[PDB]
Amino acid sequence: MVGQIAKEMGLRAYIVGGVVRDILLGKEVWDVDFVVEGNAIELAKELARRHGVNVHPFPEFGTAHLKIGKLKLEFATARREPASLKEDLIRRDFTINAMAISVNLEDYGTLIDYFGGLRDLKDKVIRVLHPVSFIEDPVRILRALRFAGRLNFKLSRSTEKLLKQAVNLGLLKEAPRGRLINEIKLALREDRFLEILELYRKYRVLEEIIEGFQWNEKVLQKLYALRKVVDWHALEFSEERIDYGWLYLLILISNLDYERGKHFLEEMSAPSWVRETYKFMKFKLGSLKEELKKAKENYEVYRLLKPLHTSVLLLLMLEEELKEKIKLYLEKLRKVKLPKEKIEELKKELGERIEELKREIMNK
Numbered sequence: 050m051v052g053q054i055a056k057e058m059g060l061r062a063y064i065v066g067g068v069v070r071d072i073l074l075g076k077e078v079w080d081v082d083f084v085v086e087g088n089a090i091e092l093a094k095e096l097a098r099r100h101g102v103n104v105h106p107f108p109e110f111g112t113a114h115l116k117i118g119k120l121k122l123e124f125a126t127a128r129r130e131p132a133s134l135k136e137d138l139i140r141r142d143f144t145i146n147a148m149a150i151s152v153n154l155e156d157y158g159t160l161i162d163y164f165g166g167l168r169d170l171k172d173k174v175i176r177v178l179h180p181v182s183f184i185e186d187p188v189r190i191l192r193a194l195r196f197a198g199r200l201n202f203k204l205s206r207s208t209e210k211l212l213k214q215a216v217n218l219g220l221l222k223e224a225p226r227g228r229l230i231n232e233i234k235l236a237l238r239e240d241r242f243l244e245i246l247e248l249y250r251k252y253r254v255l256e257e258i259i260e261g262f263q264w265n266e267k268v269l270q271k272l273y274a275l276r277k278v279v280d281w282h283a284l285e286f287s288e289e290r291i292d293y294g295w296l297y298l299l300i301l302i303s304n305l306d307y308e309r310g311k312h313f314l315e316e317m318s319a320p321s322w323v324r325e326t327y328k329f330m331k332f333k334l335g336s337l338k339e340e341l342k343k344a345k346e347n348y349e350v351y352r353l354l355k356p357l358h359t360s361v362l363l364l365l366m367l368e369e370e371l372k373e374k375i376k377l378y379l380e381k382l383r384k385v386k387l388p389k390e391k392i393e394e395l396k397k398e399l400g401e402r403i404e405e406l407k408r409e410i411m412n413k
């Protein structure tokens with residue numbers, strides 16, 4: 050599609066960055082990013098045209114978003130911020146993000162590796178292009194680790210020292226907060242997110258990020274324990290799933306104050322029930338686990354756990370004692386139902402009698 054228009058336009062168009070990586074590693078992505086030696090916006094406009102699909106150009110920035118099918122496309126004009134592709138690439142973060150694939154019909158299919166992105170790709174390694182890089186875009190500090198987390202990669206040695214420097218230089222602080230919180234967000238959407246936390250703690254990045262936070266053993270314990278819990282509840286109920294990353298985020302801010310914590314979650318654009326989970330854990334959780342343990346009958350447990358959110362329950366499973374309790378609630382007590390004739394006999398106040406029959410049959 051693009052290669053042919055680039056012929057008609059006599060341009061050169063390339064697939065660039067993570068997408069390429071995702072391809073070499075065989076991930077599927079319908080979000081595809083290009084860099085153009087030529088006018089990108091018009092290439093986009095003609096692609097859209099011939100497909101007859103709506104396209105949004107961005108004249109100021111010089112890019113265009115357009116969506117072919119459920120597949121998404123963003124065309125960007127090459128820039129050094131003319132510019133050779135190698136210039137567009139050399140400004141990027143990591144070797145494995147620095148590659149490109151030709152849609153140009155002559156070299157079509159070609160992986161373009163200047164900095165050894167493929168070499169470094171097989172070697173399972175996070176390597177920046179140049180050493181100033183961290184200073185250039187400090188958010189990368191996380192992304193690096195993030196990559197290393199998701200794909201199980203090691204930092205380049207030089208990269209390692211570079212990163213510890215940058216961290217230590219508190220660049221992590223002086224970077225605009227918005228991009229950082231953005232990153233942390235995208236980090237906690239990860240399946241490998243725990244390993245990312247391993248790297249976080251390793252470089253102590255979080256201490257340069259959130260106000261008043263530091264790491265303690267118990268936190269880590271309950272974090273791993275959380276991974277077990279999430280593994281399990283994800284296994285049993287496939288329809289009951291939530292985005293679990295938040296939990297771990299929460300587990301970090303637990304020892305923190307409620308003021309700075311809720312400020313931080315609102316800062317994290319945490320969903321309502323998330324910040325609500327923060328509030329309920331900060332305030333009434335002690336009484337919660339107490340009266341949960343103070344409940345002798347299965348139905349009392351039922352009446353205690355009903356109004357509350359699921360994530361909160363998942364958080365309540367961390368205590369060894371309450372494990373079998375939550376197991377009973379989730380697998381049994383909440384599964385019990387009722388016939389007709391009896392209801393009609395209670396009808397001859399109703400919900401009273403129903404709650405009563407609940408209390409009666411549930412205890413065993």
Ligand SMILES: Nc1ccn([C@@H]2O[C@H](COP(=O)(O)OP(=O)(O)OP(=O)(O)O)[C@@H](O)[C@H]2O)c(=O)n1
Nearest residue numbers: 065066067068141142143146147186188189192
């Ligand atoms: N802080 C950043 C953000 C991104 N990039 C560059 O931006 C491109 C893609 O942006 P991004 O989507 O953030 O990185 P991806 O590798 O595509 O990973 P993902 O799709 O998950 O975001 C890559 O070439 C990368 O080099 C960068 O150099 N520094």
